[PDB]
């Protein structure tokens, strides 16, 4: 071990450096704020077009259309206001674990156990939906994909790799290495300049899209991280794992800020999201229901129990009017 020793002391130095900036805790400051009371939300729409477990769901930027991906090899573009179906795209593989709707609205993305990201074009002549591109180059199942614009995309796979592609060519343009486990989640910043990915290392990272180097690394969980989300402000992020605990971090102090746990919760987290103002935290569980936490006081205020099987996805509209939950019983529910 010629140089396998100073890493430990450097880790200790960063540990007690971030411990130095611990004048107070968020709990002490938040003790003076009034609680939100009781949160009561009810189902408004139910979408019934899937014949298998739902693994992915995404909102569009108009907060009306949403894309859903199931394990029966079908992408469905709903219309949440009228529960109509606009497009039913059949895929060449029925093993799908992610989906995403482009911000412009002219494309969708999909992927799964085929190790290939399929990008589909919705706005074209001939009146059909065509596979615009197929992106290959990864060595594992695809966990998450997010659009930056209509020509760029970020991918996270089980081969301990996140990549930044371009659509016209087909090539990657940057590869993010460092995770020792496999990435199961990914979330871009609101300004879309740096994204957070959390793998099975019980840890999360911060990457730089422009450069391609891991700026910061966050730890504190004791099991694989399944879900991650960025706070609306852009200087914090929530997460969830299998130890039934969520925790809100912050990019400025570079350490965990709060924890959200209960002594009647023993399952894992499958999805995490915020609200428009960042006051509520929506977490999906394996107990066939979802929980709503106060993001400042870490106290439960309500539950969303309407699914026969465990919820796999969970999203919130851009305008914050409603939230959508998709579970393993092939039913999407919109709560408002």
Q: Which 215-234 positions form the footprint of other proteins (CB under 8 A)?
A: 215-217, 231-233
Q: Per the structure block, which two tokens stand in for 64?
A: 């009306």
d(CA 316, CA 261): 22
Whole-Å CA distances, 188 to 64, 258, 276: 21, 21, 16
Residue 266 in contact with other proteins, rule: CB under 8 A: no
Alpha helices in the chain (DSSP H): 6-20, 26-30
Looking at residues 164 to 203 of the shown chain, list those that interact with other proteins (rule: CB under 8 A): 178, 181-182, 184, 200
Whole-Å CA distances, 262 to 91, 92, 291, 295: 41, 42, 11, 14
Residue 176 Cβ, how far from other proteins at the closest point, in Å?
A: 12
Residue 141 in contact with other proteins, rule: CB under 8 A: yes
Rounded to the nearest angstrom, the gap between the alpha carbon of residue 27 and the centroid of all alpha carbons in its chain is 26
Q: Per-residue x/- mask for other proteins, residues 51 to 80, rule CB under 8 A? A: x------------xx-----xx-x----xx
Strand order in the sheet with 84-90: 54-59, 65-70, 74-79, 84-90
Residue 58 Cβ, how far from other proteins at the closest point, in Å?
A: 17
Residue 14 Cβ, how far from other proteins at the closest point, in Å?
A: 5
Q: Per the structure block, which two tokens stand in for 18?
A: 């971030």
d(CA 103, CA 299): 34
The residue within the footprint of other proteins, chosen from 103, 137, 150, 159 (CB under 8 A), is 159
Piece of 120-128, 144-152, 165-173, 283-291 that binds other proteins (CB under 8 A): 120-128
Q: Which is nearer to other proteins, 147 or 201 (CB)?
A: 201
Residue 158 in contact with other proteins, rule: CB under 8 A: yes
Piece of 34-42, 147-155, 167-175, 189-197 that binds other proteins (CB under 8 A): 34-42
Residue 14 in contact with other proteins, rule: CB under 8 A: yes
Q: Which is nearer to other proteins, 152 or 226 (CB)?
A: 226
Q: Which is nearer to other proteins, 181 or 220 (CB)?
A: 181
Residue 144 Cβ, how far from other proteins at the closest point, in Å?
A: 12
Number of residues that bind other proteins (CB under 8 A): 96
Partners of 152 in beta bridges:
149, 166
- Which residues lie below 8 Å from residue 12, measured CB to CB, with a gap of 6+? none
């Amino acid at each position: 071990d010629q140089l396998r020793q100073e890493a430990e002391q450097l880790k200790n130095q960063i540990r007690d450096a971030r411990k130095a900036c611990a004048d107070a805790t968020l709990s002490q400051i938040t003790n003076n704020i009034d609680p939100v009371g009781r949160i009561q939300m009810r189902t408004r729409r139910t979408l019934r077009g899937h014949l298998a477990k739902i693994y992915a769901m995404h909102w569009g930027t108009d907060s009306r259309l949403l894309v859903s991906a199931s394990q029966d090899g079908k992408l469905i573009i709903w219309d949440s206001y009228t529960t109509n179906k606009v497009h039913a795209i059949p895929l060449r593989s029925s093993w799908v674990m992610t989906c995403a709707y482009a911000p412009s609205g002219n494309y969708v993305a999909c992927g799964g156990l085929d190790n290939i990201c399929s990008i589909y074009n919705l706005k074209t002549r001939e009146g059909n939906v065509r596979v615009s591109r197929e992106l290959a180059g990864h060595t594992g199942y695809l966990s998450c994909c997010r659009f930056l614009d209509d020509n760029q995309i970020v991918t996270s796979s089980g081969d301990t790799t996140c990549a930044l592609w371009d659509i016209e060519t087909g090539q990657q343009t940057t590869t993010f290495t460092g995770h020792t486990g496999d990435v199961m989640s990914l979330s871009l910043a609101p300004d879309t300049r740096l994204f957070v990915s959390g793998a099975c290392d019980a840890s999360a990272k911060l990457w730089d899209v422009r450069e391609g180097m891991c700026r910061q690394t966050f730890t504190g969980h004791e099991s694989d991280i399944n879900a991650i989300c960025f706070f609306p402000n852009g200087n914090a992020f929530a997460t969830g794992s299998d130890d039934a605990t969520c925790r809100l971090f912050d990019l400025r102090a570079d350490q965990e800020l709060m924890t959200y746990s209960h002594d009647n919760i023993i399952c894992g987290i499958t999805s995490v999201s915020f609200s428009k103002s960042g006051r509520l935290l929506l977490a999906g569980y394996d107990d066939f229901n979802c929980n709503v936490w106060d993001a400042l006081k870490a106290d439960r205020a309500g539950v969303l129990a309407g699914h026969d099987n465990r919820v796999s996805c969970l999203g919130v509209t851009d305008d914050g009017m409603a939230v959508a939950t998709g579970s393993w019983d092939s039913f999407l529910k919109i709560w408002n």
